[PDB]
Amino acid sequence: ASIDAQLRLLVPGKVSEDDKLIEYDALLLDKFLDILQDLHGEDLKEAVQECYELSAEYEGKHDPKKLEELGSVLTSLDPGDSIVIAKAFSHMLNLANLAEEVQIAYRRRIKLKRGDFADEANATTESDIEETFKKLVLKLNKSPEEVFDALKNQTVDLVLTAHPTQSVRRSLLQKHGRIRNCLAQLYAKDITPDDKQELDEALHREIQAAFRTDEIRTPPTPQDEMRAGMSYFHETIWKGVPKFLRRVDTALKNIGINERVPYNAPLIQFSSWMGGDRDGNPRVTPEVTRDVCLLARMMASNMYFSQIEDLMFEMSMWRCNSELRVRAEELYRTARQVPPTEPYRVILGDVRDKLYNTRERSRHLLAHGISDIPEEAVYTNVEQFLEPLELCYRSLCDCGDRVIADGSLLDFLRQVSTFGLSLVKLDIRQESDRHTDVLDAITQHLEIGSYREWSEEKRQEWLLAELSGKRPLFGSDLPKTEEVKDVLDTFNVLAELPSDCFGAYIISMATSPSDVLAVELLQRECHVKHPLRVVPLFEKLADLEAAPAAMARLFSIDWYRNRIDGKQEVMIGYSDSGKDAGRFSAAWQLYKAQEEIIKVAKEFGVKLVIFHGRGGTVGRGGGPTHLAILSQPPDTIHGSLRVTVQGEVIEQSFGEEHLCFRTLQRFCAATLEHGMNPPISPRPEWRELMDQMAVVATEEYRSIVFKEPRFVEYFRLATPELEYGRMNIGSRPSKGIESLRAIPWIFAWTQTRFHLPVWLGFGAAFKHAIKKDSKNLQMLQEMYKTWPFFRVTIDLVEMVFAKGDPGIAALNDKLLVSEDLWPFGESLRANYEETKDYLLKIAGHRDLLEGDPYLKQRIRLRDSYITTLNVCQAYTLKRIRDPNYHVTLRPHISGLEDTLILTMKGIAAGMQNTG
Amino acid sequence: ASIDAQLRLLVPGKVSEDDKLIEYDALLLDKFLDILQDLHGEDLKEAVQECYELSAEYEGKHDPKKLEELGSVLTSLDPGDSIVIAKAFSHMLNLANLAEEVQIAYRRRIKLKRGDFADEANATTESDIEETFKKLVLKLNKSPEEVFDALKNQTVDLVLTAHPTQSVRRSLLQKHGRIRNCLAQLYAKDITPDDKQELDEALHREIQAAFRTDEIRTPPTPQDEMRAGMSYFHETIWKGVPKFLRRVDTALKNIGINERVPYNAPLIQFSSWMGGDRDGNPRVTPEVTRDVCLLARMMASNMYFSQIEDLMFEMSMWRCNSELRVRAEELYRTARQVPPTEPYRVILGDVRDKLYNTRERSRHLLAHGISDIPEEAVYTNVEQFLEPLELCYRSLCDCGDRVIADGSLLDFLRQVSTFGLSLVKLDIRQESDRHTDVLDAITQHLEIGSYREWSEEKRQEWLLAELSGKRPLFGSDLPKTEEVKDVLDTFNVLAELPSDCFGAYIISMATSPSDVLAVELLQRECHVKHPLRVVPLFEKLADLEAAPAAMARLFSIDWYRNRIDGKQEVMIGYSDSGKDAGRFSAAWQLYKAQEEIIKVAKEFGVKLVIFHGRGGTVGRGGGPTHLAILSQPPDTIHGSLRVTVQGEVIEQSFGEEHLCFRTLQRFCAATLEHGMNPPISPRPEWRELMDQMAVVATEEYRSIVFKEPRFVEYFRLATPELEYGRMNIGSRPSKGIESLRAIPWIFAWTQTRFHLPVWLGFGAAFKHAIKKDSKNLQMLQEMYKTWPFFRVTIDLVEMVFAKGDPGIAALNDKLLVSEDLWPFGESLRANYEETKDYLLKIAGHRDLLEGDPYLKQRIRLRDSYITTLNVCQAYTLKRIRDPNYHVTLRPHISGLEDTLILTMKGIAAGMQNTG
Numbered sequence A, B: 001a002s003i004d005a006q007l008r009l010l011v012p013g014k015v016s017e018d019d020k021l022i023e024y025d026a027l028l029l030d031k032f033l034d035i036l037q038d039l040h041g042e043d044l045k046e047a048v049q050e051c052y053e054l055s056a057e058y059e060g061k062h063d064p065k066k067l068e069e070l071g072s073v074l075t076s077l078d079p080g081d082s083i084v085i086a087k088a089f090s091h092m093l094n095l096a097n098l099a100e101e102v103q104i105a106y107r108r109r110i111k112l113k114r115g116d117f118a119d120e121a122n123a124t125t126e127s128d129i130e131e132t133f134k135k136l137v138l139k140l141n142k143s144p145e146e147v148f149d150a151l152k153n154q155t156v157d158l159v160l161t162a163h164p165t166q167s168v169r170r171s172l173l174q175k176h177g178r179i180r181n182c183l184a185q186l187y188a189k190d191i192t193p194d195d196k197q198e199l200d201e202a203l204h205r206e207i208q209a210a211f212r213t214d215e216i217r218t219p220p221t222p223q224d225e226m227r228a229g230m231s232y233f234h235e236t237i238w239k240g241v242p243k244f245l246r247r248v249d250t251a252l253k254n255i256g257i258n259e260r261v262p263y264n265a266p267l268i269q270f271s272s273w274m275g276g277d278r279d280g281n282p283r284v285t286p287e288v289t290r291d292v293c294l295l296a297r298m299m300a301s302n303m304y305f306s307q308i309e310d311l312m313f314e315m316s317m318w319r320c321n322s323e324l325r326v327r328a329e330e331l332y333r334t335a336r337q338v339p340p341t342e343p344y345r346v347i348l349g350d351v352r353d354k355l356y357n358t359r360e361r362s363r364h365l366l367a368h369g370i371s372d373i374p375e376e377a378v379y380t381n382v383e384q385f386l387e388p389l390e391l392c393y394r395s396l397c398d399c400g401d402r403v404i405a406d407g408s409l410l411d412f413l414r415q416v417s418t419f420g421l422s423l424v425k426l427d428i429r430q431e432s433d434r435h436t437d438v439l440d441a442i443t444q445h446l447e448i449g450s451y452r453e454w455s456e457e458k459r460q461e462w463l464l465a466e467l468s469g470k471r472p473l474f475g476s477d478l479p480k481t482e483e484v485k486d487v488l489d490t491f492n493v494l495a496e497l498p499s500d501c502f503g504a505y506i507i508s509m510a511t512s513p514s515d516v517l518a519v520e521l522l523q524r525e526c527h528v529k530h531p532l533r534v535v536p537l538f539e540k541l542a543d544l545e546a547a548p549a550a551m552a553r554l555f556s557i558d559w560y561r562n563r564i565d566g567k568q569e570v571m572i573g574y575s576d577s578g579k580d581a582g583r584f585s586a587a588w589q590l591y592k593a594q595e596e597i598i599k600v601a602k603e604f605g606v607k608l609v610i611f612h613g614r615g616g617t618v619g620r621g622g623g624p625t626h627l628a629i630l631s632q633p634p635d636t637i638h639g640s641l642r643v644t645v646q647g648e649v650i651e652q653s654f655g656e657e658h659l660c661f662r663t664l665q666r667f668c669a670a671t672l673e674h675g676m677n678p679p680i681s682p683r684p685e686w687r688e689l690m691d692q693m694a695v696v697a698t699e700e701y702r703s704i705v706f707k708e709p710r711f712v713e714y715f716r717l718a719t720p721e722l723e724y725g726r727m728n729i730g731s732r733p734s735k736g737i738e739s740l741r742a743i744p745w746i747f748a749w750t751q752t753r754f755h756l757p758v759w760l761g762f763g764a765a766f767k768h769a770i771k772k773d774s775k776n777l778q779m780l781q782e783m784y785k786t787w788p789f790f791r792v793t794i795d796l797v798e799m800v801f802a803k804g805d806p807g808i809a810a811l812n813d814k815l816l817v818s819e820d821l822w823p824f825g826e827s828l829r830a831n832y833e834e835t836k837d838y839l840l841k842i843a844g845h846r847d848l849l850e851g852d853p854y855l856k857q858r859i860r861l862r863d864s865y866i867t868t869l870n871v872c873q874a875y876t877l878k879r880i881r882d883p884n885y886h887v888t889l890r891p892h893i894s895g896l897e898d899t900l901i902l903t904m905k906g907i908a909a910g911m912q913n914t915g
């Protein structure tokens, strides 16, 4: 009641019977405090309470003295007390996030709505799959048969990637899951009062179990990181896929199509980078890739094996067609155990043994390299596994029992067909220099010169000479650095392993046609019988500008064209390009890049798939992902969406089963709509203005980030990037700021609540547009109201500002940055304010997130917890870095490195996605 | 809407937001009809509809022409159409029962209540475990510590037995389960509208799946029947036990006891007869018993194996006491796979392998008699399995994490401790003649005479001479009939198998102390190292009268007394005794028998457990079971309830998880209360009247059932007992009416809706009480209002009359019984009416079940469906029995033996428990 009133003082809540977020947080906190008291004593609970209040008062008034009050309580803790408190706030934050998931899961959809594109920006107002169908028939004049057709031919490929600050352990998500479920159920109307006393107890227990699953730090092998990343299949994706496909079927009945999506239409696919991306990451070896492909194969076949047992129980029926009868009797005769009066079980029992075999073979190969289990007794292609299930389906329909075939059996065909034999196909990624090195080692060995030195024309001439050559390039004889051996051994792994383990070979830092032709040649020479498609990733602005020419050249080369069989994937990386030119300029350039590359594809009759890498507005998750997809340039999806699911977004997207369902839904709805309903194309005046604004934006960003000689120094002091690197959480930080990687660049500035990488340059751009011609404000405002790409671009920056607090960034300056650099920090904070102000005026908003109060509330509630972690972090950095700084310790109330790891992860759990 | 209005015409429904039964039936029927139409054509659906209406109109007005209208539609069906219709009505009946389960599961408990013993007769008003605790502290002056103590020392042993008309297949219960769950959920307030379209579809599908799981008839091996009987463990009992124990814990916190029931207090146990009872059943061989003990061991260890995997996921914690640390490091060193930083998982992984081993060993022995798996690598005693789990519990509590130990780990300790290594312990039962035969074979072989011929005194003298003898009785050399070999081989199975597989050896038709001493000797001579306790089952009235003397003698014999170690179980069988003297007389005799046997036990200082066999008021299930227990004679439970769970009641008791929980609850609540709050003891006037009424009751019943020379003839014509026997559904029917077994006797008369065995004799008794002295009516009425035993006895008979329809029994006469026997049937129907009338006047009721409208409604709703099956059955019996009877067939609209099997099972599914 006091806990609830202090929260409601912080948030002016709402009457909606939906809105219980604050109640959820009160309850969770109250239980958590009780637990703290039981485990660590009243005084420790009191201290946690004291710190929380101080944070609350700060998020209220923003009096900066409150940060120093909190500081003086935090700096006065022996390191054992400091760990327990940083762990409390970390856990309260996670709890807050779980409460949010429950709130979003059960919030009521809004019945009356305008049916304009703004509705698509929020879960509560966005279109579901039936609404999208109906919209397409009614407002775009499509026959249902046409909508059905588009949908059958559509793919959405979600690509899973490493969590930047380490993935949650599988057992911790299950606990989280149980906390959510207890929370949901304590407010259910369907369960009575005494059933609930036990839920209170179950919830209290589960909050404690999660708290005491807290071992710390050798951060984990890439194999271990991959396993943890794959957790969401068991948690929600495995059931969610069939569940969502069944909804599609209902939407279809409701617009007059009586059929179901064929079970083998590949509407949904998952891919993975985990153990495949080695770009600037030498822990990801050849052996690691070999491993994760075996683990994928193992996990998958373990899931099918376990599920088929349930299916077998259900399939008790005795009526079959003669085709199944024949097959059953054969298998029964090999009488090596069910009755023949249960024919479906005879077939499925045989499939079960193959699955078990497929699973042991994989485990053996992982543990030893050898299996006594022969490939003949195992599944090596997904069609071998589908065939007998197709036979069951047919047999049931033939006997008049389609309605039964359409239950669990149909769910299973869809699972098999969506997940295939692994659950995910692995992309490989490596940077083009590393290919050039391999090729230079070869040219020097052959005594024909230095490939590195050759011009792009000469490279091409030679690479095409070898790709039509009749003669192998090199052997094992070849003298290799370690790095060159690593690239070759990777290709050997691709040659040994089956082609259903893989998808794309992504070339980082791609710039030329030779970049792609080099990988094609290496694949062929390493004897990859079925080469992975090669996908260039264009990173720098200059690189995006030349991309279209590069693709024109590739497509005009007979060998490549033939090889590519009318399909090409190109990858873009928003964070990467933004690190080179600033976010605004990169946003515009990538809109144009996509138009231009699509144009070139059309001209050569090549189907082009744009693979969205991290940092884009489609990575946000939730409603915003819906409008983001709808806002893609015309024809840039054309039935194939490939998109990165950022690790810092996966829990929110897929952890809770309703949210998982809505994620799959919105990816399908928006893809289908876009291909038939592109957004409006910009007015010429808008394009002109965007070009002008980009030039200015880029000049601002670059002068600060690359031309200010003391910038890197400032960045290393104000920011924990050096300590992120040295306590490496994941990869490793540089390969100056050109050299630093995207993820560390975003993470450094997110941790100080300043977020420079997201907003810098927007201010110069808007300021200059408006001084040049006051009318530009109105145009900028009109662009916001009517151009989806622009709306969505501003919305993401607005959201990032909501997560911003220049107070916190000033505290880091004060504590960590030398006095000579303070005016620099201060000018950067002046830039923040100005940039924000312009963003607000363009959006027509007085405060941040006025258009999105549900998001506003969520963020404001987390901020109490994050803020404590930020203060703790700031003063801990001061203690680690400065031996001259000492501060008197309280007597014990219930290892600075440990505290810092804890705060870095917490602030990352709290900030989730930004840029 | 038309379907719903025709149902509501049949039942004057109610406003309660609870009461949705009629809606549930409308929905289920509407879907079912759609399915029938899809599978068999509009005309077949129409015919089913036509028959249902006719039945409806009959249950409305009771115009007997409607039965013949239905007859003429049913007799005019080719046998393929007849099968499909009998199957429709069978399925509609099952559906009705599923709807009932959902209605009972979610009906609201009544808050305001008198707190007299009548409240305990209904689920809605009965006391839960907290109410019972509070009652005992408040109204009986017990300290909570005393109540806690009684409860720790209490056992309830539920003994599972064969379904009399064949157990439902395991896969069919799961389907049933899913129909219930879809039904519940379609009315949930917590799930929104679109989620529901899919439930409609899921329910329609599941009603169809159940319908097409319908293979017919070699009725099943006893092994197969046992497996099907054990289904309820997976379905609800496995989780229900821990769930109910946790409730007990909450009830305890709420009366001020801060502890939990120790995990190893044996509050709940299950036993089994399946594969153990061979009394008049030679399909139950030695080998069958060997088998079911192995299957029990296998199923159990399979469940523990699968559950421990979940537990292992949860037990991620790293803090342990040193005792667990030591053990973990040992196991890890035998490094033959988890990290040692996860000590609970190292311990539980080792337990998992033992469980897997325990499970393979059992399977091998079942399939071959030999296992390569040694007994050393397996669990052979439940304490070996508990010990490491106890170690986990302790370690968690020591480290401050009791709250975590009290979750899943505690659930698991309770499961292990409740179920032990098998899930159920097997009782053996055999009739005493068969022992006498064995002993006569021995005495003749030894050339000392004929044990059969010896007097009871001589038997005892000899059996005690051999039980103190120093010299074995016989070898393999012994000349044996097949029957005598079968008894010896059974005892050899008990000698070979471990003693945790077994419980009681029940002697059917027990009458003398030598009966029990004979089995003790046989056990010892067959080298059963740990002999099963021997339990006499007294069946005839005369036998119940001499029971107390028999037990006095046994207890006064030093050898037996020493052997028995202060514990003896005696079994009673209500149906059995009722077959000898009529229900009323048996009810009274067994009240007195129990008083007398308890008295004798007290005198000798022996703890006496009464084992309730079938047919008693405690077998009803639901609320009535609660009052039944409370009505036992004083001191006859004394902390140990052993009771039969009749197969025809198991689904209702345990199929749905709420009902399962309430079943366990009420057995605990009522047992605990009774031991501290016996019912009032009868007034002398009441005892006198009961004795007078019994003498008369017995004379009526016996003169009709045993002394009427044409009775057996009448019974064989009016009743399908001959066809129950010959199409044997289970056992086999006789060993005249003395010879016939209880179950067939009850089943024959239930099938004609006449139920003679339950009510015959009550009429003579009441009539005579009242003519003797008109005041006796008032006393009889007072007994009903204030003596629980009497209330409960009348209530069961009242319920049976609600299931009665003398119209149906008249139709069977008309069709099947020769005209010369019609006045006999008619006098029996006059007796029915008169008996009913008296029962109503005694109860203060104008109509049947006026005290229990919820039960009234349930029964009236089933009756529509049953009635069709009854008509179908009657005319099918006429066709099978009379080649001279032929009746013209409709052209086909979409095997008489098959139709009959179907109707017999349906009517049994519909009638459930009677006597």
Ligand SMILES: N[C@@H](CC(=O)O)C(=O)O
Pocket: A620, A621, A622, A624, A652, A799, A855, A910, A911, A912, A913
């Ligand atoms: N993912 C949310 C922000 C957050 O939940 O942190 C959004 O992009 O709006």
Ligand SMILES: N[C@@H](CC(=O)O)C(=O)O
Pocket: B620, B621, B622, B624, B652, B799, B855, B910, B911, B912, B913
């Ligand atoms: N078992 C119920 C009757 C029934 O459901 O058939 C009772 O004894 O009241």
